[PDB]
Design a protein around this ligand. Structure first.
Ligand code: CLA
Ligand code: CLA
Ligand code: CLA
Ligand code: CLA
Ligand code: CLA
Ligand code: CLA
Ligand code: CLA
Ligand code: CLA
Ligand code: CLA
Ligand SMILES: CC1=C(/C=C/C(C)=C/C=C/C(C)=C/C=C/C=C(C)/C=C/C=C(C)/C=C/C2=C(C)CCCC2(C)C)C(C)(C)CCC1
Ligand code: SF4
Lengths: 80, 143, 60, 31, 732, 39, 33, 91, 163
């Protein structure tokens, strides 16, 4: 499966969670930013690796990072 | 809130069929079910291609991929203002509830969730790949 | 630190490393990256603002 | 002057021994 | 899941056909394998090196065996200018009878391939004469291969496994390799030349059964031990010597004549013996430099730590670089590939102009094939050198351990280096293409006197300084009263000046404006290939577009369509892009070599001199004109022996074109297509009785770049090899 | 007229005018002084 | 050439028999669970 | 309703036999008995691979040594025109 | 380089004669005074003038019968070939420095505007013409900037990627 690690520059904008087409990401409470929330990646077994989340992220550099890993049926996006 | 149970007596939308639906993977690996409650009978676009008619009341749709279920759910939420539930169904009969995982949509922050994958540093503070040689770790992001 | 004072970015992975931006605001609640900086140039994502820590900016 | 049949068979036999040693090295490198 | 990629559980659990492909493609990347340690990595590499050496010796044994068994080596030895050398026999059951007749050549009793590798000239020069000699050499090399395989197996056994510290003992390895592997091997080769090759060139049959009976020099070893070494240079072979016979032969064994044997048009064997003897002494001396276990010799870490300019111009200098080089196999491989590939180019440049083998210069097909072969090999090796430099920067480079030294400092001004490479590439391309296009328009409009033809006066001045008097620059070796002239006048200058002032050889060919233009094209190619490779290596760890690129490794598809889009951002992709430019550059180099030599061999130098100044001249008078015999290898009227080259010519064009499919069309089109195909098989009666084990998927993004590049390169090489060999051998 | 001259100051119009001037100058130099190879 | 029948035996062996064995065995190895 | 959790997962996942029919009586008894004893030694995967290997290799070398000569393949007749002539007086 | 002056090269003369002969062969299919006859005669006149001018410039000719240019500044100055490459080098470098200095001046002047990007695609044509005229004195100004230290931006003010 792909690894999705979150860093602490996240401003809690939730855009990566909304962008995700397979529901890998979710917002959890945090105290490190003004929005009082941070992205989390609890379901990377469903991550296809499209990097829509990284395209959505506004921080410089990225606060969500996708590291493509070992390929599975789910990560290859196969319906057969 | 508790995870809902998949009601197998739910009717399916009115559809004439297609070549884009389930394949052998549903028999031997897994498939997915999306359920939703429609306010009225109306036409929606199938994620596998073609127009279908959602029945008034509860609807059930079996799909090959989780991404297909979430694409249909995005359409239901943005075009029909309708919520839905997604399950994973295994060949042995096991049904796993998937989405929304804790009853609240993931884009809305909810108490009781715990961060996984969080790194307490900015991305430029990752170490060098030479420092993880012969350790078994996936990379500098893994440490 | 001040409002609308020029600062130099010291974050190496930032698009605006060694460049000078303008402080928009500084959060006073103890968040990790409280300094909001606006820049005259867009980065590769089209963004012109970014948040920094105190040690990541130098007043110029 | 051409080679004899025996010379060709000698070369083929020595090559077969070398190939056996090669299979041995390849299996040792594998596991 | 499966057990084929047993070194990678991540690949073994892949349920798709990608598992097989990636399992093949990652098999020799031992560092990334599961549970590998540094010591086991080095031991596996050591054994793999034994396997490669055994393969090389078996390959040489096979060439010797097939020439001995199916070739015409004694007949060629009898008439080296009028016998086509045979590589091996053809047994092809698809042959028609006209193909059987056409390929029967060289006096063979059946269809054969005519060799282009020059092994006949080499083996004849070093003293081999009969099929029995070649057979004995082949059997010896097969035994050597078996010994290497046994040693590879042996040093994998636990009590013979070398420790990791043994592999990192740099000083002892350098001492031994310089003194023994280079120096003693060169000394033993001088022994072979003096005892065997030189007497066989003088008609004396010296073999294992009589070499202890045969005197190599009439005065024995007394002049050597007494130091009266000029005895061995007295009485060289005369200018009327016939090679392989005693007629006109001398008795000298170590000379410095310079130039060429008049009959063989190759270097004197006694000069070669003296070369290898001096090389042996220099290398044995250089192998006593580094400290091992006897309290004397240099320590390389301290040498490197000492070489820092006191003015601070290089920062910390070379401090810490010993551990940087010694701990990184990729730094070592990059250095080895850069040096070996440059040496391969040097071999190509020196073997055409200073042919070392008898009757090689008259074999035009062989000379062209050898130059082209070694230059393409050199290009691939240089690409690999820079690739492993980039891999070092990603995987092995520790910035803290290299703080302030030359490596960190060149990383610290990488933008300056890359931008200046970009500037020189742009200048060369703009002006070389512009001058060519201007000349093309001048020729098209009927006014060739309006061409811009810049005389290469700098290289002509170099040729004059080395003794070529054609250009009128009177200096050094072309000035008869200069000190440089008078110093060499009794030793090597007469033969050298006879050779360099003759236009009947390849020694410092006459050059003009066409040589100017193509040399600047070569400079453009070298600088652009270097720009791509260097930018790939220096941006391998990160750039502004992807500041954390080191976290993703050497090879990865992209970083997605965000931030403007990031296709081909990895350092691997810079290698992939640079291979195209390397192939282009070696193409220009070899086109130049072949066309200039075609004019020289056909006795018409004016064709190159007049037509090479514009690109239509290259197209029409080189590619179009010389393809005529090749494409008529088979036609409606019949076929001849060039039909194999016509077929391979088209074969290479086809493979080249097929590569464009992988390079132009990208993945997601094929994945959706394969999805429809997977639907079709599951729904088709009598066919859905069978099922795949691995789920069929489209090839990956990186794999597609690789496969497209491989088809492109293979088609490139096959096409040019067919054209080169057919065009040269149909005339000569 | 201000809007029209602003359009004439857009990059491709300025490029067209400048390159027409430069190309015309080169053409007329080569018409008046045909075949210049050297200075 | 001496032993001139050998190409007519070894060419089918190296070109047909050995590749068939090799791909059959390698297929069996790389599909083994 | 096209879904059911248990005892109808085959219909839910479409695991249907479109054309296969259960049938025990197709072939005559003596014909079947003949063909089971004919193909009995090849019902082991190692024996069939050994049989096909030995037969195919023997057929291929017998073709190469003898059969290619019998059908008069051009590679077995060899040349008869004396050899192609090369340029520059080379043979 | 062993070359010969084009005015005494036999190949040069043969090329002139052959080109004139081809043009004259084309001429004898048109009436005198016709437009093709006048055009061909003008081409012939230009060809004769071109060969005379190339001979009179002291150009060296190869064995091809074609002019070859000398580009070493030493060989050009001592043997009268400075008009082939050296003087064109000075002329090109002057015009190129003019173009670059005018572009730099326009960019620097636009940097101080409220909308600096607007002047990059909507050209301030009077300002551009004024700056273009002032580019004639570029070497003096550029050398002064080099000695003063204002030509180059300092390394601490320029973005770089992480090393
Ligand atoms: C100079 C030539 C050379 C050398 C010294 C090696 C050396 C090695 N290879 Mg590499 N190989 C080569 C050429 C070479 N290979 C070529 C041309 C290819 C195709 C591109 C490969 C593809 C390859 C694969 C896919 C694997 C190796 C593996 C190995 C190791 C064990 C080899 C063995 O005999 O296992 C003997 C084992 C068996 C006979 C049963 C298992 C079958 C294995 C898994 C596949 C066959 C491997 C064999 C080398 C293929 C030969 C290719 C042929 C066209 C020349 C050893 C380090 C294996 C290793 O585990 O990685 C470190 C491994 O999986 N090789
Ligand atoms: C006047 C006295 C003098 C002079 C002229 C030198 C000169 C030199 N010394 Mg020093 N030295 C001196 C006194 C002197 N030394 C004394 C008294 C001592 C005490 C004993 C030393 C101790 C010392 C040490 C220990 C070392 C030197 C080294 C050097 C060299 C590099 C110095 C440097 O900073 O490079 C600066 C270089 C750069 C900043 C990089 C420039 C890179 C260019 C721009 C690249 C261009 C590439 C090109 C474009 C591409 C190809 C071109 C194409 C046409 C082919 C240089 C040869 C070093 C060395 O090299 O030894 C051999 C070294 O290790 N010296
Ligand atoms: C002495 C020479 C030598 C040695 C020991 C190596 C060794 C290695 N190379 Mg380098 N390399 C070389 C020369 C060498 N290479 C040359 C001449 C080139 C230019 C073509 C390269 C360009 C190169 C690249 C671009 C890469 C390597 C990689 C590798 C590693 C894995 C190779 C593999 O599994 O391929 C398997 C090969 C095949 C399955 C066949 C490929 C198709 C062939 C051409 C047919 C291994 C450390 C890889 C690496 O280290 O990843 C970080 C990698 O990406 N090499
Ligand atoms: C014939 C094919 C061709 C040409 C002309 C080029 C051209 C160039 N390559 Mg590209 N390359 C090619 C094939 C080619 N490449 C292929 C097949 C690949 C594999 C993908 C690459 C991969 C590649 C890489 C990876 C790099 C290059 C770079 C370069 C530049 C080299 C420096 C130079 O020569 O500047 C001179 C420029 C040229 C010769 C380009 C043509 C200039 C024209 C003729 C100017 C005049 C235009 C005309 C007046 C306009 C009329 C327009 C009309 C509509 C009015 C140049 C832009 C390098 C680079 O960018 O360095 C700066 C670089 O890093 N190439
Ligand atoms: C903008 C570029 C440019 C420049 C600097 C010149 C310059 C000149 N032209 Mg020319 N011209 C140009 C563009 C230019 N022309 C264009 C685009 C055309 C239409 C194709 C002409 C058509 C033209 C004609 C018909 C004549 C000139 C003539 C002249 C000369 C006197 C006026 C002068 C050398 C006159 C001449 O040749 O000298 C008296 C003349 O009769 N021009
Ligand atoms: C790598 C070296 C090499 C290469 C590329 C070839 C190539 C060829 N050989 Mg020759 N062979 C070699 C080494 C080689 N051989 C050596 C050292 C010997 C002496 C034992 C032979 C003995 C030999 C015979 C007796 C015959 C050939 C034949 C052939 C041809 C058909 C293939 C075949 O049937 O081989 C069969 C060869 C063997 C089974 C034994 C050699 C096997 C080699 C050593 C394997 C090398 C593997 C390599 C290093 C890594 C892969 C082909 C031109 C045939 C022929 O000439 O057709 C006209 C034929 O009848 N070879
Ligand atoms: C080195 C490899 C090699 C060799 C030695 C041959 C040899 C042959 N091929 Mg060529 N072939 C090959 C590779 C080879 N093929 C490849 C790679 C391709 C695709 C590019 C082809 C495409 C091809 C075609 C399209 C045809 C041939 C045919 C032939 C036959 C022509 C001679 C004849 O007149 O037979 C006449 C035939 C006979 C006298 C009957 C021979 C029957 C054999 C001996 C049966 C052997 C049993 C079998 C191999 C069992 C396999 C078991 C196991 C090893 C898998 C001959 C058997 C022609 C044909 O005749 O073959 C069917 C034919 O039409 N080939
Ligand atoms: C790429 C740089 C380059 C090269 C390789 C040459 C090469 C040459 N020059 Mg040139 N030169 C150059 C750039 C170059 N020049 C520049 C930039 C200038 C202006 C400063 C000159 C000014 C110049 C003069 C004034 C002379 C040369 C001379 C020479 C020749 C002998 C020089 C020598 O070292 O004698 C030792 C030689 C052909 C000499 C020549 O004219 O006749 C041999 C001579 O007198 N050159
Ligand atoms: C203000 C104009 C200007 C100036 C002063 C420079 C200066 C420089 N360029 Mg940059 N460049 C420019 C415009 C300019 N460039 C434009 C418009 C492009 C896009 C085509 C580039 C693309 C470019 C590349 C790809 C490279 C450079 C490089 C360089 C450097 C070496 C010189 C050179 O290679 O020239 C070559 C210049 C070109 C090939 C493009 C020039 C186009 C025209 C002639 C210039 C623009 C004129 C401008 C429109 C005038 C408007 C002024 C007016 C309104 C008053 C130097 C720093 C090289 C490098 O970095 O060296 C270290 C390098 O690799 N340039
Ligand atoms: C990236 C990288 C890398 C790589 C690199 C490379 C790949 C390079 C290449 C390089 C090269 C490839 C080089 C070459 C060079 C050469 C030279 C430098 C030479 C010199 C010469 C000379 C000096 C000579 C002289 C002479 C004589 C002796 C005689 C006479 C003549 C003359 C004068 C010429 C490495 C690994 C390191 C590391 C990491 C990074
Ligand atoms: S890569 Fe795609 S699937 Fe994975 S977390 Fe990001 S948006 Fe979701």
């Amino acid at each position: 499966s792909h690894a999705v690690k979150i860093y602490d520059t996240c401003i809690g904008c939730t855009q990566c969670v909304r962008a995700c087409p397979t529901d890998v990401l979710e917002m959890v409470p945090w105290d490190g930013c003004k929005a009082s929330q941070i992205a989390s990646a609890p379901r990377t077994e469903d991550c296809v690796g499209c990097k829509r989340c990284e395209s959505a992220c506004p921080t410089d550099f990225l606060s969500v990072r996708v590291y493509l890993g070992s390929e599975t049926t789910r990560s290859m996006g196969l319906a057969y | 809130w508790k995870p809902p149970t998949l009601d197998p007596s739910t009717p399916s939308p009115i559809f004439g069929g297609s070549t884009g639906g389930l394949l052998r993977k549903a028999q031997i690996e897994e498939f997915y079910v999306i359920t939703w409650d429609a306010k009225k009978e109306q036409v929606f676009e199938m994620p596998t291609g073609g127009a279908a008619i959602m029945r008034s009341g509860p609807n059930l749709l079996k799909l090959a991929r989780k991404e297909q279920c979430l694409a249909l759910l995005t359409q239901l939420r943005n075009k029909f203002k309708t919520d839905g539930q997604i399950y994973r169904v295994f060949p042995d009969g096991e049904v796993q509830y998937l989405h929304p995982k804790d009853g609240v949509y993931p884009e809305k922050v909810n108490a009781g969730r715990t961060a996984v994958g969080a790194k307490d540093r900015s991305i430029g503070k990752n170490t060098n790949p030479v420092a993880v040689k012969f350790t078994g770790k996936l990379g500098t992001y893994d440490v | 630190r001040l409002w609308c004072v020029q600062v130099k970015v010291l974050r190496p992975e930032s698009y605006w490393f060694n460049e000078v931006g303008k402080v928009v605001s500084v959060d006073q609640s103890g968040i990790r990256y409280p300094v909001v900086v606006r820049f005259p140039t867009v980065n590769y994502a089209g963004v012109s603002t970014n948040n920094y820590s105190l040690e990541e900016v130098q007043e110029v | 002057m051409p080679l004899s049949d025996s010379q060709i068979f000698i070369a083929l036999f020595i090559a077969l021994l070398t190939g056996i040693l090669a299979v041995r090295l390849g299996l040792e490198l594998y596991s | 899941a499966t057990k084929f990629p047993k070194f990678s559980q991540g690949l073994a659990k892949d349920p798709t056909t990608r598992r097989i492909w990636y399992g093949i493609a990652t098999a020799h990347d031992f560092e990334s394998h599961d549970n590998i340690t540094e010591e086991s990595l080095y031991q596996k590499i050591f054994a793999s090196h034994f396997g490669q050496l055994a393969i090389i010796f078996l390959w040489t044994s096979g060439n010797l065996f097939h020439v001995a068994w199916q070739g015409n080596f004694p007949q060629w030895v009898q008439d080296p200018l009028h016998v086509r050398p045979i590589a091996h026999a053809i047994w092809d059951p698809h042959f028609g009878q006209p193909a059987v007749e056409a390929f029967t050549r060289g006096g063979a009793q059946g269809p054969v391939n005519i060799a282009t590798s020059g092994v006949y000239q080499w083996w004849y020069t070093i003293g081999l004469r009969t099929n029995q000699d070649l057979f004995q050499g082949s059997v010896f090399l097969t035994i050597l291969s078996g010994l290497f395989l046994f040693a590879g197996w042996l040093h994998l056994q636990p009590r013979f496994q070398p420790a990791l510290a043994w592999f990192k003992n740099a000083e002892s390895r350098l001492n031994h390799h310089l003194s023994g592997l280079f120096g003693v091997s060169s000394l033993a080769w001088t022994g072979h030349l003096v005892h065997v090759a030189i007497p066989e060139a003088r008609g004396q049959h010296v073999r294992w059964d009589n070499f202890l009976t045969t005197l190599p020099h009439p005065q024995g070893l007394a002049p050597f031990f007494s130091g009266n070494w000029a005895v061995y240079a007295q009485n060289p072979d005369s200018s009327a010597h016939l090679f392989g016979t005693g007629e006109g032969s001398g008795t000298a064994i170590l000379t410095f004549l310079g130039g060429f044997h008049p009959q063989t048009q190759s270097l004197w064997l006694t000069d070669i013996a003296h070369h290898h003897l001096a090389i042996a002494v220099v290398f044995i001396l250089a192998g006593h430099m580094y400290r091992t276990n006897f309290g004397i010799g240099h320590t390389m870490q301290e040498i490197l730590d000492a070489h820092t300019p006191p003015g601070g111009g290089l920062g910390a200098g070379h401090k810490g670089l010993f551990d940087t080089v010694n701990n990184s196999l990729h730094f070592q491989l990059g250095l080895a590939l850069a040096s070996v590939g440059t040496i391969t180019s040097l071999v190509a440049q020196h073997m055409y102009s200073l042919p070392p083998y008898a009757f090689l210069a008259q074999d035009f097909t062989t000379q062209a094939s050898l130059y082209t072969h070694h230059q393409y090999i050199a290009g691939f090796i240089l690409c690999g050198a820079f690739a492993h430099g980039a891999i070092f920067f990603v995987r092995d480079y520790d910035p803290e351990q290299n703080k302030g030294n030359v490596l960190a400092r060149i990383l610290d001004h990488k933008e300056a280096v890359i931008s200046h490479l970009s500037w020189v590439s742009l200048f060369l391309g703009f002006h070389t293409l512009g001058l060519y296009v201007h000349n093309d328009v001048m020729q098209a409009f009927g006014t060739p006197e309006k061409q811009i033809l810049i005389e290469p006066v700098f290289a002509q001045w170099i040729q004059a300084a080395q003794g070529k008097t054609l250009y009128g620059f009177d200096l050094l070796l072309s000035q008869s009263n200069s000190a440089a002239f008078s110093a060499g006048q009794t030793l090597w200058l007469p033969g050298w000046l006879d050779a360099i002032n003759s236009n009947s050889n390849s020694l410092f060919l006459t050059i003009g404006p066409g040589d100017f233009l193509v040399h600047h094209a070569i400079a453009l190619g070298l600088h652009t290939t270097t720009l791509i490779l260097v930018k790939g290596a220096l941006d391998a760890r990160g750039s502004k577009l992807m500041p954390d690129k080191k976290d993703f490794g050497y090879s990865f598809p992209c970083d997605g369509p965000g931030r403007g889009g990031t296709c081909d951002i990895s350092a691997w992709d810079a290698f992939y892009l640079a291979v195209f430019w390397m192939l282009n550059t070696i193409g220009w180099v070899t086109f130049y070599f072949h066309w200039k030599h075609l004019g020289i061999w056909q006795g018409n130098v004016n064709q190159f001199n007049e037509s090479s100044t514009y690109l239509m001249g290259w197209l029409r008078d080189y590619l179009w004109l010389n393809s005529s015999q090749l494409i008529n290898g088979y036609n409606p009227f019949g076929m001849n022996s060039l039909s194999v080259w016509a077929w391979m010519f088209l074969f290479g064009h086809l493979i080249y074109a097929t590569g464009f499919m992988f390079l132009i069309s990208w993945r997601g089109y094929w994945q959706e297509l394969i999805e429809t195909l997977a639907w079709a098989h599951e729904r088709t009666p009598l066919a859905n009785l069978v099922r795949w084990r691995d789920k069929p998927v489209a090839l990956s993004i990186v794999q597609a770049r690789l496969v497209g590049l491989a088809h492109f390169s293979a088609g490139y090489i096959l096409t040019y090899a067919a054209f080169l060999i057919a065009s040269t051998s149909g005339k000569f | 007229m201000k809007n029209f001259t602003t359009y004439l100051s857009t990059a491709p119009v300025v490029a067209l005018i400048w390159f027409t001037f430069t190309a015309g100058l080169l053409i007329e130099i080569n018409r008046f002084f045909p075949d210049p190879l050297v200075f | 050439m001496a032993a001139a029948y050998l190409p007519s035996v070894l060419v089918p062996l190296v070109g047909l028999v050995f590749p068939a064995i090799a791909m059959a065995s390698l297929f069996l190895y790389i599909e083994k669970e | 309703s096209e879904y059911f959790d248990l005892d109808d997962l085959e219909d839910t996942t479409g695991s249907w036999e479109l054309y296969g029919q259960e049938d025990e009586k197709r072939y005559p008894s003596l014909q079947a008995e003949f063909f089971n004893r004919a193909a009995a030694p090849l019902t082991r995967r190692e024996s069939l691979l050994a049989f096909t290997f030995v037969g195919g290799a023997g057929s291929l070398l017998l073709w190469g040594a003898k059969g290619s000569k019998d059908v008069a393949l051009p590679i077995q007749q060899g040349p008869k025109k004396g050899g192609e002539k090369g340029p520059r007086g080379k043979i | 380089s062993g070359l010969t002056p084009c005015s005494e090269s036999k190949g040069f003369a043969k090329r002139q004669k052959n080109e004139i002969k081809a043009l004259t062969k084309r001429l004898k299919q048109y009436e005198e005074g016709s437009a093709p006859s006048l055009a061909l005669k003008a081409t012939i006149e230009r060809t004769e003038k071109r060969f005379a001018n190339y001979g009179n410039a002291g150009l060296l000719c190869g064995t091809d019968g074609l002019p070859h240019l000398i580009s070493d500044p030493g060989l050009a100055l001592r043997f009268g070939h400075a008009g082939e490459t050296l003087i064109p080098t000075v002329g090109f470098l002057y015009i190129a420095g003019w173009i670059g200095t005018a572009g730099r001046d326009y960019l620097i002047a636009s940097k101080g505007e409220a909308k600096p990007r607007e002047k990059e695609y909507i050209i301030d044509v009077p300002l551009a013409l004024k700056i273009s005229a002032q580019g004639a004195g570029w070497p003096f100004r550029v050398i002064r900037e080099l000695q003063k230290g204002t030509l180059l931006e300092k390394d601490s003010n320029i973005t770089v990627s992480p090393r």
